[PDB]
Design a protein around this ligand. Structure first.
Ligand SMILES: Nc1ncnc2c1ncn2[C@@H]1O[C@H](COP(=O)(O)OP(=O)(O)O)[C@@H](O)[C@H]1O
Ligand SMILES: Nc1ncnc2c1ncn2[C@@H]1O[C@H](COP(=O)(O)OP(=O)(O)O)[C@@H](O)[C@H]1O
Ligand SMILES: Nc1ncnc2c1ncn2[C@@H]1O[C@H](COP(=O)(O)OP(=O)(O)O)[C@@H](O)[C@H]1O
Ligand SMILES: Nc1ncnc2c1ncn2[C@@H]1O[C@H](COP(=O)(O)OP(=O)(O)O)[C@@H](O)[C@H]1O
Ligand SMILES: [Mg+2]
Ligand SMILES: [Mg+2]
Ligand SMILES: [Mg+2]
Ligand SMILES: [Mg+2]
Lengths: 50, 149, 389, 170, 523, 526, 99
């Protein structure tokens, strides 16, 4: 990937988009009712605190 | 992917939020299109992806990966199928038929078997059991001489 | 040549390195007599060491040497001869002959002295007129083995160790218009900061064409003023040689900067590092062109060189030396440099002095007589200076 | 896919190429006898860029060996990992007449590289390993790069070359 | 601990240095003195690379030897200076220098300062030159028989003497066709436009000189014609193919059609170039660079024959022969750059190899000499001999004067100097006579190589020259008698003799001035 | 010595030592090479450092594979190489005659003579011998029987009779089949191929072409009974733009669109070929074969195979001309102007497999101007020997056609020149008569060597041969199975005129140049 | 003592380390010996009652067989005559596969 942008408002939106994506995945996991989560791939500190 | 170098370029946030979802939906559509024809087992000669494996398991598709570039041709001769150089749902003429396909264990060895009931077939295999690799090699040479005779 | 010998030798003793650098300094300052000063200095040391071996303090010897040197320098201005009193041409010729004696060109003294004096006089510069100047080493000296040394020639003009750019060009121009340039004539290339990015494919052909068209436009601008000879320090591309070939003009590349400077000043041209003017556009004006009476390419002993003859803005001279082989040619050049320097010094300062040891004998007699009037321990040092002379 | 073929020229060039092929073979799952032991699939993903698989599971390198000596290629063969090369991938007095020396050697090399490029599907380049300042790298290498370019003037050719008082008015 | 002044420098001085220099010069002279005259024998040399050089040329002998003594190096250098200046006489110069330097130690050992000897030599050289100019003979350059006689007398010493009639004709035709005058009045006879091609095989009598050029090249595509009667030739310095620029350009494509459109524009460019070439309606295209397959297709569609990758010098010779000029940008192609002076283009096979002939030119200014023969060594020797003959012819054309050979000129000059010396007083008289009597080594060596009585023949010849009109009497090298050179017919250019004498005397003067040697100072 | 005082590490051999060294080297070479001459010569085995085996009888191969480091040997080897590459035969006789000339010259030089007298005698004898050879030759129409005789004479000296009889017909037929009555014969139009099985008596001539590669796609047909042939050198692989380019997409759908769009350039050419095939071969009765000098992608291979096309990729460049000459089409670099007039016709195309190798046969051409010689045998050295013999035979037949004349053989010509020179020599003045005698005695070496190899007495056999040809003016040579004199022309032993001419010239020139060397010196850098 | 220096000609012009054999006594009778020994080596593995043979190659790999072609392939032969016999055997194996 590569990001090309012209304005600071779009810059801020781009910054917010990644947090939105990660939180969307986390909420999708949470709303299923699961109480234990296991993964083969790294679980970040943000995910751990969430 | 493209043969030439490619790059995903994004100028807004909606594209960033939609790219992965679109890719996953496209892969799901392709796999279900393959599965709709009635295929039970897919044989490939190269790498498999995690998402493709996930959808194949979802739709109850047996996936076998063999890689010699000659074993693939021999299997095609055995079953009656034609190798497809692009990932597209096969036509009936390109579809192979085998009676039994399974995984078995013989003497600490995991094997995958494609088996017919036909007495003719196209090819056949001889499974040798011995207590020593040298003895098995000698029996192999004897079998070769018999075939040549 | 003493300076050359001492420079080629490798020495480990600093007391000897002092004499080596003394010879080098003499060569830089004057250009003649780099072998006599070493002998004089060594003899002075040898004679002072005996007095030091006797119970004489070195400070007395040093003061005596300083006093003797001062008196000798003052007295030498009595043995002077004013060159204007003598007839100038034979005075200069005799000075040159004396300088060239004891070299490989000794017997040909009159021939080579006439050549040297002619070159030095032709290279004279017109200063503020307070003092005229004679800038030697502005003459180009070339070596090429072959015929006998008495066939070495003086060229009224300039000589270039360069050949024409392409074999399709003419090799002789009668009335020469000269343009001297200080930049390359290759196809253009955008700088590091600039880059080309294409999103509409239809726009590539015209960019590729303009890349080659800019230099053609420059060359047409240059040639529109009637220039016949183009001299360039940078390179010239194969695509750009064809324009000169069709126009019927000579192009020379990889010319040395000092050679270009001398040619430009001799022929009245102006050196250009760019075609821009005091406005935005680029122009070439027939006002900044040199004029020469002939430009030829001449063959010398299986190689080629270029002669530019009878420059009109000023006068210039060059020398081509012929010899049996490279060693002889190099020695001839080294021997000719001394004569050029001697003639320059004589012309700058109109005073000459006899040679053969007369000066040393007179100085020894005078200092020996003068040593008595001191009546001290400096008398011994002064006498030693006189005897070592 | 994207097959690349290799040329080795000269004594030192042959030795360097042999070392490179040895080390790449140990990195992959390839062993001296031409079979496979590697446990990671990533050792077999791009095996076809450097190897041709023969009927029976054996692998051969996509390499060409050239020298004007009957001893260098023999030394490579005697040395370890020298038997894995195909026996016909070798090219072997110095100066005869003929008005041109080496014209048959270069033709043999061109024929062998043509036969090798026939087997590959979508080849992309040639990796040439030779001495640069050497006689075989300048003269006896009779513009072999130029010959290869003339033969295939569309593919890349990557070569590992061994390395004043007058200051008045104006 | 070790106190030194000049580390490991070896110094030698005195009479030892002069004796060593003279001995080294005499040794260099002694190596070669068997290769003078029509009765000379060959020498075979083994070079470091593994070849063989079977030759008789003095410069070829001397340049293949490595020596340590600097006097030997000086003699080796003067040999090649003579070879570059005139091309003939590289053995007589060495022999003469050896004798002129050998006759000096007699006066050195009798406590005579070298400066007197130098002055005497420089005085004698001028009187040598004056006598040589006095005894000259004029020659008419329009007399082909006289020119052939001169060339035959020049090559009657080498191995091509069995085919002198062929060799002389080849050399004369080549020189005459290469002679050129152009813009201004710069007359020149540059011999980089007279190529020599050696092809082993056949017979030597098949050697010839062509009215045109021959190259080792073939047609790019088999369907092109290999025989054209009256062709129109165009020469190019550029490549007929698509190549990248140099301004660091990149392409960014985000649509479907851009890739195919970009791929098509290259073919469009190639077609434009090919059509621009075709507009002139030529028959042959020659280029020093590559030619693409699509360009070949278009040219063949237009019935053109193309040649790839010719050398720059060969392109220049073709241009000078056919009258065309090289063009780098086809857009700037005119009717003037098309050469029509050819008369046949052919492509033949000579022993499993293809060759291209451009022959039957109307007025060519460049030529190719084609030599056939037994093998490379013989062809190389023939090439060297042909170079000697051609340079002799060029010297004759640039200066039409002749002097008798066989030693007649040497004996005449010696007699003149001996007669002039008796009007001199002082110590210089003895060296002045010594040089004149040292000029006799050439007839003495000729007599020795013939195999006769030097003691009798030399004094007989001296007595004959003592008379009044006998300046052309000399030695016949095949039998060993005295003969007038007028009836025999041996003459040589004046420039060769002048260069020989000047080089010999100046080398002796240079070597007589050394007094000490310093070695091992590491730059 | 003078050279030693300047370079102590130099090596030198002066007047007599140089001559001794040269004569010794020449005699040493001829002593080994004299056993090859004639059909009765023996076979030499050569083993290299790598362990390879080469059985040979040819003089040039022996010279360049025997282990020797002598300068005179190098000179003689270069001369033999020139002889070989120009004429194709006579390499052994060159060395034999050079050695005999040097020996006979030294025989007289040892008594105080000077080499120049012998040199002049050599020149006069050479002129007389050339004059005699110009008249002894026989001019004929060069019909098939004469060519068969010449080829059999040239081939019988390398292999046994059973294989020579097989090779002669094939060589003569190929030469006649690629010949037009103008435009001198151009080789490279006969292809030499070797297949390792089916013992050499199966070597044959194919009126077509054999290619050492076959079809790469499994589903392509293995045999075509009536084939159109297309020959091209256009590229059907994926190609990248010369200028740097890259795809910039936004989503997976756009990526798919670009992936589809990056193949139209090659798919267009494939479509053009397919349309031409469907236009010409309407029904499924004929076949279509494509030969390409460049690569073909798997996608293109599948697309072609779906319509019954047999495609071969990466053929050699000379095959572009050979296929055109044989089938009768046009080799083209572009598909812009494709038309049926660019196609060729072939009556049969099929495929053969040898373990790991594959071959393709194009056969039954209408009027082929190019053919192929298919060599077979069970050994690599057998194949190499047969290849060398085939080269010899082809060169001999081509030279016989190029010349209008052929010459009797088996030493008759040497006997005749010796007899003529003996009678000529009294006319010469001076001591050159000794040189003439030496030249004749050197010329008399070939019949002596032939008799010695056949197993008779040299002196008695030569005396009988000279006893004839003097009482009867016939040209008389040696019979190798009885030792009696015979007439070469009636029996059928022939030789080339150009070979003899070149041999005489080269031998005389080399002997004359060798005899005049004064010293041998190695004084350069090591 | 004294030495027998060399013979003039080819014996002196031969390279160092090279070998030149000629005549019936030095070539034919030695080639026959080499071929006879090679045949004797594998004579004992012929027929139903042939005995197995164990060979270790240059890579320390172990072979146990009584097949003549495998034995000859695993052995390394330095004599040219035995090499030609080996190639004859290999050609027979390729052509038929038994014998
Ligand atoms: N004709 C002459 N007669 C006497 N002395 C001379 C003559 N020419 C030069 N000299 C002397 O030669 C010396 C110059 O020595 P030299 O080595 O030639 O130059 P330098 O040492 O000055 O570089 C001076 O002392 C000068 O007086
Ligand atoms: N037929 C001849 N008779 C007598 N002297 C000859 C004859 N031909 C050439 N010469 C002499 O031989 C001398 C040397 O010529 P050559 O041996 O070719 O060597 P170079 O030409 O290099 O000096 C010439 O000065 C010439 O006078
Ligand atoms: N059947 C034959 N009877 C007599 N002489 C023959 C016969 N065949 C060939 N020759 C002679 O053998 C000579 C040499 O031929 P060969 O041994 O092949 O070597 P090369 O051809 O290289 O000299 C020829 O000159 C020929 O005359
Ligand atoms: N039962 C048997 N009785 C007698 N001879 C046999 C029997 N079986 C095989 N043979 C013989 O063994 C011979 C050689 O067979 P083998 O030992 O396998 O070596 P190869 O077949 O390679 O020559 C054959 O000629 C065959 O006749
Ligand atoms: Mg001075
Ligand atoms: Mg000469
Ligand atoms: Mg023969
Ligand atoms: Mg069996």
């Amino acid at each position: 990937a590569e990001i090309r942008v012209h304005t600071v408002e779009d810059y801020q939106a781009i910054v917010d988009a990644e947090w939105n994506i990660l939180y969307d995945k986390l909420e999708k996991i949470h709303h299923s009712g699961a109480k234990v989560v296991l993964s083969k791939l790294p679980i970040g500190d943000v995910a751990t605190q969430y | 992917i493209t043969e030439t170098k490619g790059t995903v370029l994004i100028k807004t946030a909606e594209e960033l939020m939609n790219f992965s979802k679109g890719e996953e939906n496209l892969m799901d559509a392709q796999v279900k299109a393959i599965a709709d024809t009635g295929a039970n087992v897919v044989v490939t000669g190269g790498k498999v992806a995690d998402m493709a494996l996930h959808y194949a398991n979802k739709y109850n598709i047996m996936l076998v990966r063999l890689n010699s570039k000659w074993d693939l041709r021999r299997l095609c001769k055995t079953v009656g199928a034609t190798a497809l150089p692009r990932l597209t749902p096969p036509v009936l003429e390109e579809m192979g038929h085998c009676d039994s396909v399974y995984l078995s264990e013989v003497g600490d060895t995991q094997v995958v078997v494609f088996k017919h009931e036909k007495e003719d077939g196209a090819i056949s295999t001889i499974v040798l059991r011995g207590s020593t690799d040298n003895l098995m090699d000698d029996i192999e040479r004897a079998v070769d001489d018999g075939v040549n005779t | 040549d003493g300076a050359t010998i001492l420079k080629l030798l490798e020495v480990e003793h600093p007391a000897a390195k002092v004499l080596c650098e003394l010879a080098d300094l003499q060569d830089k300052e004057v250009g003649d007599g780099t072998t006599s000063v070493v002998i004089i200095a060594a003899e002075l040391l040898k004679n002072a060491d005996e007095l030091v071996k006797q119970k004489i303090h070195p400070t007395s010897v040093i003061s005596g040497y300083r006093l003797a040197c001062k008196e000798a320098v003052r007295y030498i201005n009595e043995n002077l001869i004013v060159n204007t009193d003598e007839l100038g041409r034979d005075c200069l010729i005799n000075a040159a002959k004396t300088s060239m004696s004891s070299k490989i060109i000794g017997i040909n003294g009159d021939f080579f002295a006439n050549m040297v004096v002619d070159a030095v006089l032709a290279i004279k510069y017109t200063d503020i007129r307070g003092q005229p100047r004679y800038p030697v080493n502005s003459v180009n000296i070339l070596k090429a083995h072959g015929r006998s040394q008495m066939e070495s020639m003086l060229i009224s003009g300039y000589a270039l160790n360069c050949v024409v750019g392409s074999q399709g060009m003419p090799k002789r121009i009668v009335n020469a218009k000269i343009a001297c340039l200080d930049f390359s004539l290759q196809k253009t290339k955008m700088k590091l900061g600039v880059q080309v990015v294409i999103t509409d494919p239809e726009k590539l052909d015209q960019i590729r064409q303009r890349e080659s068209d800019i230099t053609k436009e420059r060359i047409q601008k240059i040639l529109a003023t009637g220039a016949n000879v183009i001299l360039t320090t940078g390179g010239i591309d194969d695509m750009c040689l064809k324009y000169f070939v069709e126009a019927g003009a000579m192009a020379v590349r990889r010319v040395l900067k000092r050679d270009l400077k001398r040619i430009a000043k001799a022929s009245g041209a102006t050196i250009l590092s760019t075609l821009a003017n005091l406005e935005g556009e680029e122009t070439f004006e027939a006002a900044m062109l040199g004029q020469a009476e002939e430009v030829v390419q001449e063959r010398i002993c299986d190689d080629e060189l270029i002669l530019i003859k009878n420059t009109k803005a000023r006068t210039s001279a060059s020398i081509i030396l012929r010899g049996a082989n490279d060693f002889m040619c190099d020695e001839m050049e080294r021997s000719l440099h001394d004569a050029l320097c001697v003639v320059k010094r004589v012309l700058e300062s109109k005073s000459v002095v006899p040679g053969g040891g007369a000066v040393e004998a007179a100085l020894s007699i005078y200092l020996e007589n003068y040593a008595t009037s001191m009546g001290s321990r400096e008398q011994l040092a002064i006498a030693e200076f006189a005897r070592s002379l | 896919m994207r097959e690349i073929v290799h040329i080795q020229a000269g004594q030192c060039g042959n030795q360097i190429g042999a070392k490179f092929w040895e080390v790449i073979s140990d990195e992959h799952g390839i062993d001296p006898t031409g079979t496979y032991h590697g446990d990671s699939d990533l050792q077999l993903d791009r095996i076809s860029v450097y190897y041709n698989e023969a009927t029976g599971g054996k692998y051969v390198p996509r390499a060409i060996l050239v020298d004007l000596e009957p001893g260098t290629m023999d030394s490579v063969r005697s040395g370890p990992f020298g038997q894995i090369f195909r026996p016909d991938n070798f090219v072997f007095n110095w100066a005869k007449g003929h008005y041109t020396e080496g014209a048959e050697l270069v033709d043999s090399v061109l024929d062998v590289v043509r036969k090798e490029a026939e087997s590959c599907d979508c080849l992309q380049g040639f990796q040439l390993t030779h001495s640069l300042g050497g006689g075989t790298g300048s003269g006896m290498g009779t513009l072999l790069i130029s010959k290869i370019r003339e033969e295939y003037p569309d593919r890349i050719m990557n070569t590992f070359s061994v390395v004043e008082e007058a200051e008045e008015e104006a | 601990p070790v106190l030194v002044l000049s580390q490991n420098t070896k110094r030698e001085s005195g009479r030892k240095v002069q004796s060593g220099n003279i001995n080294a010069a005499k040794t260099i002279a002694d190596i070669i003195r068997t290769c003078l005259g029509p009765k000379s024998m060959m020498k075979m040399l083994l070079d470091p690379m593994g070849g063989i050089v079977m030759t008789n040329d003095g410069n070829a002998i001397l340049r293949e030897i490595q020596v340590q003594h600097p006097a030997a190096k000086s003699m080796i250098e003067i040999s090649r200076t003579q070879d570059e200046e005139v091309g003939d006489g590289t053995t007589s110069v060495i022999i003469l220098a050896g004798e002129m330097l050998s006759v000096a130690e007699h006066f050195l050992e009798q406590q005579m300062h070298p400066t007197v000897v130098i002055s005497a030599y420089r005085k004698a050289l001028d009187d040598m030159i004056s006598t040589l100019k006095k005894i000259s003979i004029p020659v008419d350059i329009s007399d082909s028989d006289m020119m052939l006689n001169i060339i035959n007398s020049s090559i009657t010493t080498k191995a091509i003497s069995r085919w002198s009639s062929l060799a002389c004709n080849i050399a004369l035709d080549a020189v005459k066709m290469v002679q050129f005058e152009e813009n201004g009045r710069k007359e020149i006879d540059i011999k980089k436009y007279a190529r020599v091609e050696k092809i082993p095989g056949g017979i030597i009598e098949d050697s010839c000189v062509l009215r045109g050029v021959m190259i080792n090249k073939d047609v790019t595509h088999p369907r092109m014609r290999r025989y054209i009667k009256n062709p129109r030739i165009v020469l190019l310095d550029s490549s007929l193919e698509y190549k990248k620029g140099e301004s660091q350009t990149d392409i960014e494509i985000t649509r479907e059609e851009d890739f195919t459109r970009i791929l098509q524009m290259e073919e469009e460019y190639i077609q434009q170039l090919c059509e621009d070439i075709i507009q002139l309606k030529p028959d042959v295209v020659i280029t020093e660079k590559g030619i693409s397959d699509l360009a070949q297709h278009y040219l063949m569609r237009a019935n053109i024959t193309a040649i790839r990758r010719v050398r720059k010098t060969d392109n220049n010779r073709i241009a000078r022969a056919c009258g065309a000029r090289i063009v780098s940008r086809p857009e700037e192609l005119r009717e003037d750059d098309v050469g029509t002076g050819a008369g046949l283009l052919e492509i033949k096979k000579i022993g499993d190899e293809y060759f291209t002939f451009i022959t039957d030119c109307k007025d060519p200014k460049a030529c190719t000499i084609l030599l056939r023969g037994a093998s490379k060594e013989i062809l190389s020797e023939v090439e060297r001999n042909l170079q000697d003959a051609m340079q002799v012819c060029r010297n004759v054309l640039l200066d039409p004067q002749l002097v008798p050979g066989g030693g007649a000129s040497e004996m005449a000059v010696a007699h003149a100097l001996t007669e002039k010396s008796k009007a001199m007083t002082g110590v210089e008289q003895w060296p002045y006579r010594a040089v004149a009597q040292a000029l006799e080594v050439i007839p003495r060596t000729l007599i020795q190589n013939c195999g006769a009585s030097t003691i009798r023949l030399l004094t007989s010849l001296r007595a004959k020259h003592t008379q009044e009109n006998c300046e052309t009497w000399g030695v016949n090298g095949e039998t060993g008698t005295l003969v007038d050179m007028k009836e025999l017919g041996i003459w040589e250019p004046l420039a060769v003799k002048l260069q020989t004498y000047k080089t010999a005397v100046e080398t002796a003067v240079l070597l007589l001035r050394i007094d000490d040697i310093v070695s091992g100072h590491k730059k | 010595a003078a050279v030693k005082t300047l370079n102590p590490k130099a090596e030198v051999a002066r007047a007599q030592a140089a001559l001794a060294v040269n004569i010794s080297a020449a005699r040493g070479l001829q002593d080994v090479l004299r056993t090859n001459l004639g059909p009765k010569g023996t076979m030499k085995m050569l083993v290299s450092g790598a362990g390879d085996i080469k059985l040979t009888k040819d003089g040039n191969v022996l010279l360049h594979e025997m282990q020797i480091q002598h300068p005179t040997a190098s000179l003689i080897a270069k001369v033999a190489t020139a002889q070989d590459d120009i004429t194709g035969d006579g390499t052994t006789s060159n060395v034999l005659i050079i050695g005999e000339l040097l020996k006979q010259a030294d025989l007289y030089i040892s008594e105080g003579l000077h080499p120049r007298i012998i040199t002049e005698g050599f020149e006069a004898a050479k002129e007389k011998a050339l004059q005699f050879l110009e008249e002894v030759k026989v001019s004929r129409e060069m019909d098939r029987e004469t060519l068969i005789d010449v080829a059999r004479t040239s081939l019988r000296t390398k292999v046994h009779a059973e294989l020579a009889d097989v090779l002669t017909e094939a060589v003569v037929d190929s030469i006649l089949a690629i010949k037009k009555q103008d435009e001198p014969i151009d080789l490279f139009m006969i292809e030499i191929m070797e297949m390792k099985h089916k013992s050499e008596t199966d070597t044959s001539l194919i009126r077509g072409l054999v290619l050492d590669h076959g079809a790469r796609h499994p589903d392509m047909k293995k045999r075509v009974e009536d084939a159109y042939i297309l020959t091209c050198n256009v590229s059907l692989e994926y190609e990248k733009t010369e200028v740097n380019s890259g795809f910039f997409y936004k989503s997976a759908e756009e990526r798919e669109k670009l992936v589809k769009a990056e193949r139209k350039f090659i798919e267009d050419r494939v479509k053009k070929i397919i349309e031409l095939k469907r236009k010409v071969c309407g029904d499924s009765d004929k076949g279509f074969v494509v030969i390409n000098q460049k690569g073909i992608d798997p996608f293109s291979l599948d697309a072609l195979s779906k319509e019954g096309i047999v495609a071969l990729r990466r053929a050699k460049r000379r095959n572009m001309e050979r296929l055109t000459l044989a089938c009768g089409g046009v080799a083209l670099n572009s598909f812009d102007d494709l038309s049926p007039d660019c196609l060729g016709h072939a009556g049969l195309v099929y495929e053969y497999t040898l373990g790991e190798e594959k071959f393709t046969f194009i056969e039954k051409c209408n009027n082929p101007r190019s053919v192929t010689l298919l060599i077979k045998g069970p050994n690599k050295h057998t194949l190499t020997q047969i290849k060398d013999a085939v080269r010899d035979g082809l060169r001999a037949v081509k030279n016989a056609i190029d010349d209008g004349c052929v010459v009797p053989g088996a030493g008759a010509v040497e006997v005749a020149m010796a007899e003529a020179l003996i009678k000529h020599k009294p006319s010469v003045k001076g001591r050159a008569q000794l040189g003439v005698q030496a030249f004749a005695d050197a010329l008399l070496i070939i019949p002596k060597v032939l008799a010695q190899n056949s197993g008779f007495d040299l002196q008695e056999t030569l005396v009988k041969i000279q006893a004839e040809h003097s009482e009867s003016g016939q040209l008389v040579g040696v019979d190798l199975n009885t030792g009696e004199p015979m007439v070469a022309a009636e029996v059928g032993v022939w030789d080339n005129y150009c070979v003899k001419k070149q041999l005489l010239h080269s031998c005389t020139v080399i002997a004359t140049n060798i005899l005049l060397v004064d010293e041998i010196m190695r004084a350069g850098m090591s | 003592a004294l030495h027998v220096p060399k013979a003039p000609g080819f014996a002196q012009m031969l390279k160092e380390g090279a070998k030149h054999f000629s005549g019936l006594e030095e070539a034919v009778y030695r080639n026959i010996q080499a071929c006879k020994e090679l045949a004797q080596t594998t004579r004992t593995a012929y027929g139903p009652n042939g005995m197995n043979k164990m060979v270790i190659n240059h890579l320390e790999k172990l072979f146990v067989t009584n097949d003549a072609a495998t034995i000859l392939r695993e052995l390394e032969v330095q004599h040219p005559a035995a090499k030609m016999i080996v190639m004859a055997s290999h050609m027979q194996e390729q052509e038929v596969g038994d014998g």
